[PDB]
Design a binder for this molecule. Structure first.
Ligand code: GTP
Ligand code: MG
Lengths: 81, 73, 418, 105, 82, 77, 73, 98, 74, 55
């Protein structure tokens, strides 16, 4: 399962865009099997509103549009079941 | 004659049909494959936005939560 | 103030009294020594972690007099106010009055049935219907209360008589038929047919903490195996109905000549086998039986005597007493709904008056109406406390009240005081 | 309440048996129809159906439940031998009929 | 089963007020509730999006369209939340 | 009592003029003649046609396979 | 699921699909993200405080949660 | 489901002769893919892998959407992405231009 | 696992349903499934235009059902 | 030191069977009615004699 892939990438500074256009730059901490993303060090820019600082964030897994991963990630040893 | 939709999609696979999505756009092509979950794969389709031709895009995999209905011709 | 440790907060009991739908006013009664105060002891043990029975003696938590301890019989009716969960998990507030079962203290039951709405009649499964049971059915019908019957002491069908299973089913059916006959003799209502299929008859054993209806044991099946509609499964565990293992159905005709009834096959014989493996085979095949049923015990718990070990096994198996709560909620009305026949029966001046219509809705504010029937003494005996129910309004500490006696009329105004 | 325990005299009889000292029960409900077919899942079984109803130690285990002290126990402490009266029940129960005067005194 | 469903069955018989996806607020005594959020309610004051107040005496709400419910405040001393 | 899947089975027995509504679509409805269903209520229509609410231009569809996640109402005529 | 067992009784903000704001004490949750929040205040945008009480929030309308303040005594 | 077996390998027969096999060619031949997704965006890139939920991992993508002023299409570059499968209209193998 | 909805209190009563796009309908309930699909007899249409159109025995899929309203006393 | 003991149930069955001559057949305390210690203390306090009881 690819969601089981997502819990092998803890402590990584990624960005997340949701279905409302909100963008979140932050370090990932927890991944559930329902893709419930628990984040920390959060910079949250809501669509057409001001970016804010947040200490700990808890995104429900359904309303996630997409993730964006940095350049220094070797996934070729991470998709191996 | 009981014609359920699943033997309809597993029997008439290959003929040139047209699918129509939830947003109102239509795909003209012949069906390549279809599963029990009713995901579909059709080849060399054409794009009609509200019946008007847009351009060439290719062969399309269509998902359950995007299709409206599946008609012929 | 100081209070013992209780599984629920007392502020929950303080806030739950303000809703008149979630209360039941229930009087437990029965013949002499058929298991009333021991069932109350089991309820107190369910609600209190720090109150447990001695290994050799009965608790008698609601027997507080010295005469009640020295004689060994109940003398004075004693109230208790508890919070109990049902099968589905909703908390309910119960006001349970323990009345003495001796015939000469029948006056203690009449003072208990004036302030209640439902009757729980305990019947010994060994002795059956006796004198005071026959008198209390009449006294509960003529006072216009709802009647439920709980059959206590079924372990005497196991450990004393040593009776075959379908014969014990015949015994229970004869007891329930005798209850239905004594109901149909006095009642004019044809809708008072008692049957365990309606959730109206519960089975129990007070000494070893056993209490079940059909629905609770069906809930035990639904918690053990899963994916079973237990409320539909409990509708077919009484009467001449048979499980056919070929089609997996419940049919009224015989599959074989040796096919047992469903109540014997699913309910009564597992009870026989639990008691048999605890009593007779504690040394050889008891860990296999406890490992099959899903109950784990400590090695120090396995060295106890036969009676506390059997009580512990039945308590860990059956658990909380949800069937009694389900019965006392389904077949006994709330004090908001059941207020109207109470005002029609007990209030002089009729229900058609102005104050009767105000008391007919159980209004928590307005005209303060209370009816006190019982008088309790203190430890010193120099003063008494009144005990009753609040018909309407909210009674307050420090409020001036008007006491009206039995000789009061509107013409005289003599038997009254502030 | 009257203990209605009935003793077993034959070990070859089953442990749960209708001993005819017990009086015979005289013989004679919202039963739904068979058409609304309720069906259990296949792994649903009655509890403890592999275990038999009675074993060899069942009737003895029930008979020891109504034994006097300490024969109803299964664990305890030892007692020094001069603190065990063996005659106490005999003069504690009652006087038998036909005994002489001095035995009653 | 989870914790909030036991709290939902705990609030039966009391006056709750529920808002659904159509922006309508229904206040009244909760009669029945299930594992899913199918709520049978009675004696209902109805607030629409524009602001009209209606009196509808029996309402049965599907649990799918519900945004949220509002429960009585004395459930903080309920046993399953302690 | 009648459960709705047996009434859909009676509809395909009667080959009635089934008008199907749609989720989120108050304007565009489809007339049709039902033939079969499944466990997820996917429905084939023999002679289906499309009717709007503001426009009302009846266009021919043929035997369609309308999904279960789209329909709202199965009404006759 | 210990990341939500760590969030117990914390004063937390909740963002809906509609953009409204539920700030409440995190009392209970489940696998379907149904929230039990006591003493909830609603913020919407013109800003206003709307007192709710005990809120049972369905998981289908919750997007993201964050922590605002420590638990009271 | 009538196949409750533990050795469940229909989801890769789903990936070979089923509808989702469109992506596996882009796993094996490593072809360019175009994705139309729900807030009117067009994602062109190369997918690495996916599952039966079509939760895809993409690399070296260009994604476009138009803005309204009158609608002009803007584009941006992203090195690597994870895309949840419910948030798509269509997934497209780009045809052989040659 | 899907238990049927407790709709025995509303059997053979006159209820009005709300549907997704602000839609409204009325009629008699005749039964259900554990997926809350409803069979309605004597179904009158009653759209937002205000004009009433009777159809007959109809089936509503549960996914678009918003609320039931019992016009008759239960 | 031979202080505490615990046995098995067939052993207790055998020891109850062999000691049948010293043990009475009583099953309940409906026996000893007005022939127990409290009635004997009452006869002591009221200076009377139970038939069969002590003086
Ligand atoms: N075998 C057996 N004996 C029981 C059971 N429940 C109670 N008894 C015993 O019967 C005797 C009387 O029980 P009580 O509960 O005191 O009887 P009671 O109904 O309170 O009598 P009242 O004072 O009239 O209320 C005690 O020795 C109990 O241990 C039971 O389930 N099985
Ligand atoms: Mg008593």
């Amino acid at each position: 399962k690819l969601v089981r892939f997502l819990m092998k990438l803890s402590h990584e500074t990624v960005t997340i865009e949701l279905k409302n256009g909100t963008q979140v730059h932050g370090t990932i901490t927890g991944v559930d099997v329902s893709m419930n993303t628990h984040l920390k060090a959060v910079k949250m820019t809501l669509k057409n509103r001001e970016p804010v600082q947040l200490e700990t964030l808890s995104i429900r897994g359904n309303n996630i549009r997409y993730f964006i991963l940095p350049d220094s990630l070797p996934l070729d040893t991470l998709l191996v079941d | 004659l009981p014609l359920n939709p699943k033997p309809f999609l597993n029997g008439l696979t290959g003929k040139p049909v047209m699918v129509k999505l939830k947003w109102g756009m239509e795909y003209k092509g012949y069906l390549v494959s279809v599963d029990g979950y009713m995901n579909m794969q059709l080849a060399n389709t054409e794009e009609y936005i509200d019946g008007a031709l847009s351009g060439h895009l290719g062969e399309v995999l269509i998902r359950c939560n995007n299709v409206l209905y599946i008609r012929g011709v | 103030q100081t209070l013992p440790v209780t599984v629920y907060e007392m502020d929950f009991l303080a806030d739950l009294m303000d809703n008149s739908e979630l209360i039941r006013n229930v009087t437990l009664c029965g013949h002499l020594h058929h298991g009333k105060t021991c069932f109350v002891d089991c309820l107190i043990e369910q609600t209190h972690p720090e109150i447990r029975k001695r290994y050799d003696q009965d608790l008698c938590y609601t027997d507080i007099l010295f005469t009640e301890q020295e004689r060994g019989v109940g003398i004075k009716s004693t109230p208790v106010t508890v919070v109990l969960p049902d099968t589905k998990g909703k908390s309910y507030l119960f006001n349970i009055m323990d009345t003495p079962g001796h015939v000469n203290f029948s006056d203690e039951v009449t003072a208990g049935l004036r302030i209640s709405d439902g009757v729980v009649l305990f019947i010994d499964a060994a002795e059956g219907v006796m004198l005071n049971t026959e008198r209390l059915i009449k006294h509960a019908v003529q006072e216009r209360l709802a009647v439920t019957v709980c059959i206590n002491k079924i372990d005497r069908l196991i450990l004393e008589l040593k009776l075959p299973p379908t014969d014990a089913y015949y015994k229970l059916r004869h007891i329930v038929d005798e209850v239905n006959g004594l109901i149909s003799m006095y009642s004019t209502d044809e809708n008072l047919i008692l049957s365990p299929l309606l959730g109206n008859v519960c089975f129990s054993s007070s000494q070893y903490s056993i209490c079940f209806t059909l629905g609770s044991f069906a809930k035990i099946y639904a918690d053990t195996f899963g994916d079973i509609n237990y409320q539909e499964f409990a509708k077919r565990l009484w009467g001449d109905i048979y499980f056919n293992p070929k089609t997996r159905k419940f049919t009224k005709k015989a599959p074989t000549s040796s096919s047992q009834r469903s109540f014997v096959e699913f309910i009564l014989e597992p009870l026989y086998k639990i008691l048999a493996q605890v009593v007779g085979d504690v040394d050889t095949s008891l860990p296999r039986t406890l490992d099959e049923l899903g109950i784990h015990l400590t090695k120090e718990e396995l060295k106890l005597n036969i009676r506390p070990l059997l009580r512990l096994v039945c308590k860990k198996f059956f658990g909380e007493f949800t069937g009694f709560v389900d019965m006392c909620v389904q077949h006994i009305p709330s004090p908001k709904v059941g207020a109207k026949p109470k005002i029609e029966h007990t209030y002089t001046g009729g229900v058609d008056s102005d104050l009767g219509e105000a008391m007919s809705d159980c209004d928590p504010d307005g005209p303060l109406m209370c009816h006190t029937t019982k008088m309790y003494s203190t430890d010193d005996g120099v003063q008494f406390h009144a005990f009753g129910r609040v018909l309407s309004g909210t009674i307050h500490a420090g409020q001036p009240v008007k006491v009206l006696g039995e000789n009061y009329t509107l013409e005289d105004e003599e038997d009254s005081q502030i | 309440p009257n203990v209605v325990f009935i003793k077993t005299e034959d070990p070859d009889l089953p442990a749960f048996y209708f001993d005819p000292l017990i009086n015979p029960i005289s013989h004679r409900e919202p039963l739904p129809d068979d058409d609304e077919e309720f069906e259990l899942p296949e792994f649903v079984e009655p509890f403890l159906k592999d275990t038999p109803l009675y074993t060899d130690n069942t009737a003895n285990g029930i008979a020891l439940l109504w034994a006097p002290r300490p024969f109803n126990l299964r664990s305890g402490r030892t007692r020094r031998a001069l603190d065990i009266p063996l005659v106490k029940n005999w003069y504690r129960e009652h006087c038998p009929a036909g005994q002489p005067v001095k035995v009653r005194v | 089963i989870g914790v909030p469903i036991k709290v939902l069955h705990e609030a039966e018989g009391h006056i709750v007020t529920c808002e659904t996806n159509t922006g309508e607020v229904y206040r009244g005594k909760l009669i029945e509730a299930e594992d899913n959020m199918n709520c049978q309610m009675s004696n209902i004051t109805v607030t629409y999006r524009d602001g009209r107040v209606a009196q509808l005496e029996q309402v049965y709400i599907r649990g799918s369209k519900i945004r949220f419910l509002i429960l009585p405040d004395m459930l903080k001393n309920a046993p399953m939340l302690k | 009592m009648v459960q709705p899947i047996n009434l859909i089975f009676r509809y395909l027995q009667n080959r009635s003029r089934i008008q199907v509504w749609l989720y989120e679509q108050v304007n565009m409805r489809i007339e049709g003649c039902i033939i079969g269903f499944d466990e997820y209520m996917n429905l084939v229509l023999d002679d289906a046609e499309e009717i709007h609410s503001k426009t009302k231009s009846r266009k021919q569809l043929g035997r369609i396979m309308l999904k279960g996640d789209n329909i709202t109402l199965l009404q006759s005529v | 699921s210990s990341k939500m067992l760590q969030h117990i009784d914390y004063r937390m903000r909740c963002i809906l699909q509609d953009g409204r704001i539920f700030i409440g004490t995190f009392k209970a949750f489940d696998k379907h993200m149904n929230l039990i929040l006591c003493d909830c205040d609603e913020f919407r945008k013109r800003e206003e405080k709307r007192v709710l009480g005990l809120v049972l929030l369905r998981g289908e309308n919750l997007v993201s949660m964050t922590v605002e303040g420590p638990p009271p005594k | 489901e009538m196949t409750p077996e533990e050795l469940q390998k229909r989801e890769e027969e789903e990936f070979n002769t089923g509808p989702l096999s469109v992506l596996t060619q882009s796993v094996k031949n490593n072809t360019q893919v175009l994705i139309n997704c729900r807030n009117n965006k067009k994602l062109l890139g190369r997918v690495k892998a996916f599952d039966r939920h079509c939760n895809m991992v993409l690399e070296n993508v260009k994604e476009m959407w138009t803005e309204v002023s009158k609608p002009v299409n803007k584009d941006r570059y992203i090195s690597k992405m994870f895309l949840r499968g419910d948030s798509v209209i269509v997934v497209l193998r780009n045809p052989l231009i040659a | 696992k899907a238990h049927p909805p407790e709709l025995k209190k509303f059997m053979d009563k006159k209820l009005s349903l709300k549907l997704n796009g602000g839609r409204h309908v009325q009629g008699i309930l005749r039964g259900f499934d554990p997926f809350m699909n409803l069979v309605i007899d004597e179904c009158v249409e009653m759209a937002t235009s205000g004009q009433q159109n009777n159809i007959g025995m109809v089936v509503i899929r549960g996914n678009s059902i918003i609320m039931l309203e019992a016009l008759e006393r239960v | 030191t031979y202080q505490r003991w615990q046995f098995t149930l067939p052993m207790m069955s055998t020891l109850y069977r062999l000691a049948n001559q010293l043990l009475t057949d009583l099953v309940d305390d409906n026996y000893f009615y007005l022939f127990d210690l409290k009635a004997f203390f009452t006869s002591k306090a009221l200076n009377m004699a139970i038939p069969g009881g002590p003086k």
